[PDB]
Amino acid sequence: TAKAIRQTIANLEPFMPQGMKVVYPYDTTPVVSASIHEVVKTLGEAILLV
Amino acid sequence: MHFFSFKDAMVFAFAPPSVLELGNATGFDLFLQDQAGVGHEVLLQARNKF
Amino acid sequence: WGSSYVNDFIDRGRVKRVYLQGRPDARMNPDDLSKWYVRNDKGEMVPFNA
Numbered sequence: 001t002a003k004a005i006r007q008t009i010a011n012l013e014p015f016m017p018q019g020m021k022v023v024y025p026y027d028t029t030p031v032v033s034a035s036i037h038e039v040v041k042t043l044g045e046a047i048l049l050v
Numbered sequence: 051m052h053f054f055s056f057k058d059a060m061v062f063a064f065a066p067p068s069v070l071e072l073g074n075a076t077g078f079d080l081f082l083q084d085q086a087g088v089g090h091e092v093l094l095q096a097r098n099k100f
Numbered sequence: 101w102g103s104s105y106v107n108d109f110i111d112r113g114r115v116k117r118v119y120l121q122g123r124p125d126a127r128m129n130p131d132d133l134s135k136w137y138v139r140n141d142k143g144e145m146v147p148f149n150a
Contacts, residue, residue: 015085087112 002029101127 009022016022054061067076082100084093103121110116126135134149 012085084113087114089113 002027101133 013022051063054063064075066074082093082097101122103119105117105119107118108115109118122136126132131149134147136148137145138148139145
């Protein structure tokens, strides 16, 4: 749904006026992506080191 | 479509698709939308240009 | 003082609202609430602090 939001505004920014932009001051999905990436990184190192 | 080429009405005859539940005409279809808030006549002349 | 919403109005193709309220300097202190007048039955105006 975060990707759906980021793509459903990405087709709206061509129609924005020149004195505007969009940023994301508050977001929670990067810690989810970083957590799952970190745990699969630890598992991928673990299965070769053993 | 040869006999109906008469003066008064712009009569258009066709056959429905084989599944009438799915649409009423074969071929593509699309919408032209006003995103910036421009008036109706601009979209009308854009439709005429298209 | 209650900001009554009366009906709708069109703006740039989108439907918006029209509100009704006094000016800010008419409502900032308690004695400013004494600045308002009501019309009685026979026609004339009577102040609110009366």
